[PDB]
Symmetry: C2
Subunit: 132 residues, 2 copies
């Protein structure tokens, strides 16, 4: 699956939940949130075996179509063929991504105050998108 | 609060469920499904008091920015402040909209074989979008 959601108005405090299933041969997938495809507050990209990266979560921002400095995480609570729910929230200081085992944090570099764009790409099958 | 979902590949037989709450002071809302904003396979529009309509579901299609002939349905199972889930599925011949109280049918006028666009508009707050 790989859909795009626009016309959003997610503000700090609100929670965005993405439920789906990781393909049984996933190279990796990504979950981007921001203003648009060129300006992302967060590029959550768990990589099983993609671009030389093996079982590593890469976080990054994007502004004016330019990638920021990568932030590689130590924890990788994901496995192929796994059905997971990803919860995203943020504030003026950072973005939080919670999965049942680990909570990932990434600084709100762009100082964005609302999310209007969400896109899921890669080897992930979306089953539901919830707002809270 | 009306969002837009693009980049979809909903094939006939697949179920799209929109769950949310109708505002207590709602006058109307709509669920559009199709190719893009100007080419819709279905414009499901429950009107409480909208365009001179009082408690009536108006269904229609749109091709190249032009509405087809309005289809007013006999049943109106909605009430303001009501929390609902609207299920949509289709095939080459017709589109089905299931509401816990009533099921609506509309012919697939355009012969559309996949849904790439979904937009919810009006006095409706979306809580979740599921793909079954």
């Amino acid at each position: 699956q790989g859909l795009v959601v626009t016309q959003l108005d997610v503000q700090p405090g609100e929670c965005v939940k993405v439920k789906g299933k990781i393909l049984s041969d996933a190279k990796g997938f990504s979950v981007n949130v921001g203003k648009d495809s060129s300006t992302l507050m967060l590029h959550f990209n768990p990589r099983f075996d993609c671009h030389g990266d093996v079982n590593t979560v890469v976080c990054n921002s994007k502004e004016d179509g330019t990638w920021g400095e990568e932030d590689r995480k130590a924890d990788f609570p994901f496995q192929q063929g796994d059905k997971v729910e990803i919860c995203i929230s943020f504030d003026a200081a950072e973005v939080k991504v919670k999965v049942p085992e680990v909570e990932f944090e990434f600084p709100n570099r762009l100082g964005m105050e609302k999310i209007q764009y969400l896109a899921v790409e890669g080897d992930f099958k979306v089953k539901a998108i919830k707002f809270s």
